[PDB]
Amino acid sequence: TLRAAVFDLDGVLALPAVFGVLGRTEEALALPRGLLNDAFQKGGPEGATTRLMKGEITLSQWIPLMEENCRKCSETAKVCLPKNFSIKEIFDKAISARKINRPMLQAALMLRKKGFTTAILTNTWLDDRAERDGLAQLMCELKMHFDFLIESCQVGMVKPEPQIYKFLLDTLKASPSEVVFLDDIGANLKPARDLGMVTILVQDTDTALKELEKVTGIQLLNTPAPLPTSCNPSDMSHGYVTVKPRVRLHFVELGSGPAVCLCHGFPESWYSWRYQIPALAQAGYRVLAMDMKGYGESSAPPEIEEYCMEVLCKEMVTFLDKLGLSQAVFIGHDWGGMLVWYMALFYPERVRAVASLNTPFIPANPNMSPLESIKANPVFDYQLYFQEPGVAEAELEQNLSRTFKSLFRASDESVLSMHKVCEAGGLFVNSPEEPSLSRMVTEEEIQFYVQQFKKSGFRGPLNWYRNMERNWKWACKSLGRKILIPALMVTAEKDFVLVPQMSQHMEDWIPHLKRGHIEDCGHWTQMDKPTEVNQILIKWLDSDAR
Amino acid sequence: TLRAAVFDLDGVLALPAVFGVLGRTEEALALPRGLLNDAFQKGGPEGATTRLMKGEITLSQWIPLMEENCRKCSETAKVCLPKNFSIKEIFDKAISARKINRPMLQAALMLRKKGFTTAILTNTWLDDRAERDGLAQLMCELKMHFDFLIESCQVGMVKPEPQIYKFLLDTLKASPSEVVFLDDIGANLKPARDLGMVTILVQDTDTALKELEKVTGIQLLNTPAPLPTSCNPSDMSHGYVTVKPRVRLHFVELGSGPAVCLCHGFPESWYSWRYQIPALAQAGYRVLAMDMKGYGESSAPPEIEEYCMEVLCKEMVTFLDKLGLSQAVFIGHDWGGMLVWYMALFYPERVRAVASLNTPFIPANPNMSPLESIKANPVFDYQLYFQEPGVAEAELEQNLSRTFKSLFRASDESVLSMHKVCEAGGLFVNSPEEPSLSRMVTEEEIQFYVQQFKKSGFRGPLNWYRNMERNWKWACKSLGRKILIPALMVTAEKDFVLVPQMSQHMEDWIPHLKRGHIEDCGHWTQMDKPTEVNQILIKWLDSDAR
């Protein structure tokens, strides 16, 4: 039975194939049919291209050799190459036009998710052209989704030489009958068939996937839309900055470009952004996903006052200073969304742009105590339950799996009622001991949160709610200000605590405010609707944060 | 006796002052003298600017108020403001023109180095303009060199109000007679004098520093050229990437822009780049200074073969993959310089540009064993001493302070002779037990290296020399290639092992090669000549790596 799937790059995972662009160039230049492809393969195993594909020479060294083979071929065909004929320009355009064939990658992704060992096997070159980054980026995006990447120029062997297939089988640790091999060139498919591998001749992707799904017994065509790429914690770059003597902030970092600082809510983790981190990096940003103060690998001092907005914002400024960043775009959710509005109000010169998921911006009322304000709305009762030190910690730390399974649920999977929490005596009094797994989370994702919370528990995280009076006094100093830097408010239709209507008057204080809105989305926005979060954020980043 | 020094921003640490640009704008627009400065201060403590300076309103909210005060002032003066008069444009230009007054910063730097507590005290605003990053960058560069930054808009108080001075003294934890206060505005200097502080009215910087040096008894004028900014390890962002199951790479990260990966030599650390990290970040680059495999906080497996060039380069590619970087510019020194030439030859698509300090690029000789080659040159004898496992480890680990004090020396401070090391029976056989401290290093810098080497010792670092045959075989595969990506070779005049003449034929293999050369520089380039290294690297990065 099949356990491995191997994919070619050109004409399989990437379209159009170079071979196909040479064909179009021949037509456009009115050259004899096949002239360029003939010059490309000239000399066969003893030719310039085999040396290139084996990594003997670089692409820039090969260009003159190709130029000569074209001149030679045009001489034998008794034709003239045009005036400004250029291999460099034809090849820059061909490499540039090549994009990932998304349904083919999607099928490879499904096979791997279903237990298959996946690999990319390609005849490729050492690219030293000035525009080599284009291909480097393509390879980077592809390679992360496969168990192996086998490049001709790195192993010194080429398809269709029998040796590269025997090398392939060795790296896969599989017998030929256990492998499906996908290739758009019949000649390169032949040695794979000869060894006893299942082979697919890729012409149109749809027929190739029909043959691939029939042979594997795994549905690849007509599948429901997949979730965006997530994060494996052990595969990320982990960073640590000391912001003051006893306080260190931990973050996960991915990508290059403008810095985007992601700030989670209560009781979360940098991991709550797992579905946005790969997407924003791929979109052209340097993502810094925090473990906010009190969480995960960041320090968790016990004092309440260490968690007031004024100190938290000051530490985020120091965090940028120490990393050598004059600005970052700040994206927050829940308590993180609150922090982010305060960064914009108190440190606008350090904030490139600001976005909040669910948390509205409501100016402090100077004529009313924040505790009076909280009492006025029944959906905020859980916040009064969180006031007394030790009470909510005892309930939330009793059984970590139960806490996370009860909280991280979709709008329809409701297991908690945040009104009369104090009266009932807890968040979980009418909740099961062993809750069912929500559709948004896997058992393994829940266990990651359980492991993070074993370090410091809930004291630090609950302290974010224990500075109502302190935050109110500090917020009152900003009452004469408006937020005039680029800003985005994302409301979630079914968040029954941070209701979309609580955001209705934000335009009075943020005149240029931009909005996003997600239907059928509860409180846990990033994991409830990851695809739609990614779409909204990327579109806003690309228009407003550069 | 004085123990603290306080500096104003406008007209002291930054030139020209805004006040001075308004003066020039008045002249250029043929406005009555002082009209703009009068409009700027209109209403005094009850006016628009005091509200701005106290952080009640943002700079964008203040622009219309200033526009009205200008209209009002022009009305009373019976003049007309010109057709396209714009406060936004005048203020964008004024803020933009303001640059750090380098000799004033240099003097503040000297006072702090000599035990003084330093501070910046400024009347400033919350900048929410589209071009606010310019000022954010200026403040970032300045703030890192002082113990405190006191901003009017953050404390809700302004000079010349008596309260801000009393706040200043409290944050300094000093009595008035212990403080020197530098200001370009007499009115703002008066409350400081009134409290009993030494005051300096800053007009020209030279006279101000003459008064400052006379009062402190510290030489600030006519001083020898200072070293570039260095790194305090506990103030850096530390990153960690797992490149394979038992291997993790540690790096220090600073700055934003194109990624620049710094690779140290033997027996070094990320800390060997201490003088380049702040300079390259300030120059517009995102610096990643590695602890190479076998060093510091990076993993140090014991097997020799874990340190061959092929595996080391493969791990550096994975390091970029995991961080989401399609390319980095690679800068190496000694063994690091070797690695970096191999990255360029084997992975040119991942290398933006390549630079080596001291280590030349010499193609492998396929007709001669690398051990034959090493034996031919007497200055390479230490490399044969390094061959036998355990021998050099025992000598180098016996006394860590002695090892580092003996190695890290300038060309004139020579304490070691690398010829006849094997015959003599060690590197230190004719070296003192307690070497003197070299001029390039402080005791505290030596102790940092001692602490790093207590983790894994010298097995991993020495293993970099124990793959001569393995590296030769891998290098032979690249003999048909040329290095055609942007490249820089920096030779050090007095490196008596990596001699500048060993680099003479590099142009045969790297035709577009650029060069730098440092006179009176030994082997430890970065710390011997930090200023000249920074100059060469920045100029090359800005022309060749963007």
Q: What secondary structure, in 3-state letters, does A369-434 show?
A: CHHHHHHCCHHHHHHHHCCCCCHHHHHHHHCHHHHHHHHCCCHHHCCCCCCCHHHHCCCCCCCCCC
Exposure of A384 in the CB half-sphere (CA atoms within 13 A)? 20
Q: Tokens at residue A402, please?
A: 């139960």
- What was the elucidation method? X-ray
Question: Is residue B534 classed exposed, middle or buried when 0-12, 13-18 and 19+ CB atoms within 10 A define those classes?
Answer: buried
**Which of A132, A238, A254, A349 is the mutation pick for testing B, counting most B CBs within 10 A?**
A349
HSE toward the beta carbon, residue B131, CA cutoff 13 A: 10
| DSSP letters for B284-335 | T-EEEEEE-TTSTTS---S-GGGGSHHHHHHHHHHHHHHHT-S-EEEEEETH
Instruction: Determine the Cα–Cα distance for residues A235 and B67; give it in Å rounded to an integer.
Output: 55
* Cβ–Cβ < 8 Å for B234, A243: no
Nearest to B254 among A133, A323, A346 (CB): A323
C-beta separation of A290 from A262 below 8 A = yes
Q: Which two tokens stand for residue A226?
A: 């997949």
CB B509 within 8 Å of CB B361: yes
Residue A201 β-bridge partners: A183
Cis peptide upstream of residue B176 (ω within 30 degrees of 0): no
- Kindly state the tokens that stand for B164: 């801000």
CB A287 within 8 A of CB A260: yes
Residue pair A32/A209 in contact by the 8 Å Cβ criterion: no
Q: How far apart are CA A89 and CA B355, in angstroms?
A: 28
Look at strands B514-518 and B487-492 and give their pairing: parallel
**Whole-number Å distance between alpha carbons of A58 and B482:** 7
Judge whether B310 and B343 are in contact, CB under 8 Å: no
User: CA nearest B171: which of B163, B159, B161?
Assistant: B163
Tokens found for residue A342: 């305060």
CB B370 within 8 A of CB B469: yes
DSSP state of A466: S
CB contact under 8 A, A482 and B242: no
Question: Max alpha carbon distance in chain B (Å)?
Answer: 95
Give residue for tokens 């030596």: B446
A279/B391 Cα distance (integer angstroms): 51
> Which chain B residues are within 8 Å of A61, Cβ to Cβ?
480-482, 484
Q: Please name the amino acid found at residue A233.
A: P
Nearest to A295 by CA among A259, A314, A267, A275: A267
Cβ pair A527, A275 in contact under 8 A: yes
Residues of chain B found within 8 Å of residue A144, distances taken between Cβ atoms: 321
Query: Smallest Cα–Cα separation from B295: which of B445, B450, B456?
Result: B456
Alpha helices in A114-236 (DSSP H): 133-143, 152-155, 162-172, 186-195, 205-216
**What CA–CA distance (Å, rounded) separates A381 from A429?**
15
- Measured CA to CA, the distance from residue B134 to residue A172 in angstroms comes to 53
Give the gyration radius of chain A's Cα atoms. Answer: 29
Asked whether B344 and B330 are in contact (CB, 8 A), the reply is: yes
Alpha carbons within 13 angstroms on the beta-carbon side of residue B36 total: 22
Q: Are the beta carbons of B324 and A482 separated by less than 8 Å?
A: no
- Chain A residues whose CB is inside 8 A of the B350 CB are 136
Q: Residue B239: beta bridge partners? A: A239, B251
State the Cα–Cα distance between residues B97 and B112, nearest whole angstrom. Answer: 28
A481 and B350 within 8 Å at the Cβ level: the answer is no
Contact A507, A515 (CB under 8 A): no
Closest CA to B269 of B297, B247, B234: B297
Angle at alpha carbon of residue A94, lines to A90 and A100, rounded to 5°? 175
**Which token pair is B33?**
């003298």
User: A243 exposed, middle or buried (CB, 10 Å; 0-12, 13-18, 19+)?
Assistant: buried
Residues 6+ apart with CB under 8 A from A325: A259, B255, B256
CATH superfamily for A236-546 is: Alpha/Beta hydrolase fold, catalytic domain (3.40.50.1820)
Q: Is the bond leading into A233 cis (omega within 30 degrees of zero)? A: no
Q: Is the Cβ–Cβ distance between A44 and A53 less than 8 Å?
A: no
B334 is catalytic: yes
| Pairwise CB contact (< 8 Å): B61 & A477 | no
To test the contact with chain A by mutation, choose from B157, B241, B256 the residue with the greatest count of A C-beta atoms within 10 A, namely B256
Q: How far is A76 from chain B (nearest CA, A)?
A: 29
Angle at B145 between CA B140 and CA B149, to 5 degrees: 65
Q: Which residues of A are annotated as a binding site?
A: 8, 10, 122-123, 184, 382
Chain-chain contact of B326 with A240 (C-beta, under 8 angstroms)? no
- Of A51, A60, A239, which is closest to B237 when you measure between CB atoms? A239
B480 vs A324: CB contact, 8 Å cut-off? no
Q: Tokens for A16?
A: 């159009």
- Please report the sign of the dihedral spanned by the C-alpha atoms of residue B75, residue B76, residue B80, residue B82: negative
Q: A360 CB contacts (<8 Å, ≥6 apart)? A: A489, A498, A502, A503, A506
Residues linked to residue A516 through DSSP beta bridges, in sequence order? A490
- Annotated binding site: which residue ranges of B? 8, 10, 122-123, 184, 382
Give Cβ neighbours of residue A26 (< 8 Å, ≥ 6 apart).
Answer: A32, A33, A34, A35, A36, A37
Which of A137, A138, A229, A256 to mutate against chain B (most B CBs within 10 Å)? A256
Render B26-89 in DSSP notation, one character per residue.
Answer: HHHTTPPTTHHHHHHHTTGGGSHHHHHHTTSS-HHHHHHHHHHHHHHHHHHTT----TT--HHH
Cis peptide before A160 (omega within 30 of 0): yes
Q: How open is the CA angle A487-A493-A438, to the nearest 5 degrees?
A: 115
Contact B324 A256 (CB under 8 A): yes
Chain B interface test: which of A144, A237, A310 (most B C-beta within 10 Å) = A237
Grouping H, G, I as helix, E, B as strand and the rest as coil, residue B35 is helix
- Provide the annotated binding site of A for Mg(2+): 8, 10, 184
B147 is catalytic: no
Q: Whole-angstrom Cα distance, residue B404 to residue B435?
A: 9
Q: How far apart are CA A523 and CA A496, in angstroms?
A: 7
Report how far residue A545's alpha carbon sits from residue A352's, in angstroms, rounded to the nearest whole number: 6
Inter-chain contact A143–B239, Cβ cutoff 8 Å?
no
The position carrying tokens 């399974």 is A405
Amino acid at B108: A
| B349 contacts on A by Cβ (under 8 Å) | 126-128, 132-133, 135-136, 139
Find out whether A197 and A190 touch, Cβ atoms under 8 Å: no
What is the C-alpha separation between A98 and A9, in angstroms, rounded?
Answer: 10
Structural resolution in Å:
2.0
CA distance B515 to B500: 11
Tell me the sheet residues that pair with B250.
B240, B291
Nearest-CA distance B446 → chain A (Å): 23
Q: Are the beta carbons of B431 and B408 closer than 8 angstroms?
A: no
CB pairs under 8 A between A and B: 153
Strands (E), B148-197: 148-151, 179-183
Structure tokens at B428: 């230190």
Query: What is d(CA B498, CA B493) in angstroms, rounded to the nearest whole number?
Result: 9
First to last CA, chain A: 49
Residue A334 annotated in active site:
yes
Residue from A38, A183, A334, A528 carrying the catalytic annotation: A334
The sign of the CA dihedral B390, B395, B398, B404 is: negative
Subunit contact A324:B281, Cβ cutoff 8 A = yes
Option in A128, A140, A253 nearest B326 (CB): A140
CA distance A15 to A33: 21
Set of chain B residues whose Cβ sits within 8 Å of the Cβ of A135: 349
The first and second tokens of residue A317, run together, are: 């400024």
Are B1-16+97-217 and B236-546 the same fold in CATH?
yes
Rounded Cα gap, residues B371 and B390, in angstroms: 19
Q: Which residues contact B205 (CB under 8 A, 6 or more apart)?
A: B101, B103, B104
Distance CA A439, CA A443 (A): 10
For B58, the closest of A61, A235, A481 (CB atoms) is A481
Chain A partners within 8 Å of B57 (Cβ): 480-481
Cα dihedral A372, A375, A376, A380 in deg (nearest 10): 130
Q: Which residues contact B64 (CB under 8 A, 6 or more apart)?
A: none
d(CA B371, CA A49): 35
CATH no. for B1-16+97-217: 3.40.50.1000
CA distance A56 to A64: 15
Determine the Cα–Cα distance for residues B62 and B57; give it in Å rounded to an integer. 7
- Look at the domain B17-96 and name its fold: DNA polymerase; domain 1 (1.10.150)
- Is B256 in contact with A136 (Cβ distance < 8 A)? no
Please name the residue that has the structure tokens 């790096």: B251
Helices (H) and strands (E) in chain B, counts: 24, 15
Catalytic hit among A285, A307, A449, A465: A465
Among A250, A264, A333, A523, the one annotated catalytic: A523
From residue B344, alpha-carbon distances to A138, B347, B502, B526 in Å are: 19, 6, 19, 22
Domain boundaries, chain A: 1-16+97-217, 17-96, 236-546
Helix axes B87-97, B18-28, angle to 10 degrees: 130
Q: What is the largest CA-CA distance in chain A?
A: 95
Find, among B121, B134, B122, B55, the residue nearest to B91 by Cα. Answer: B134
User: What whole-number distance in Å separates Cα of residue A71 and Cα of residue B110?
Assistant: 68
- Of A482, A479, A483, A499, the closest CA to residue A491 belongs to A499
How does DSSP classify residue B101? -
CA distance B312 to B343: 10
Q: Say if strands A14-15 and A99-100 run parallel, antiparallel, or are unpaired.
A: antiparallel
Phi first, then psi, for residue A183 (nearest 5°) are -145, 145
Three-class SS of residue B512?
coil
Contact A334, A382 (CB under 8 A): no
Among candidates B156, B326, B348 on the partner chain, residue whose Cβ is nearest the Cβ of A477: B156
CA of B417 vs chain A CAs: smallest distance (Å):
41
The single-letter DSSP state of residue A32 is P
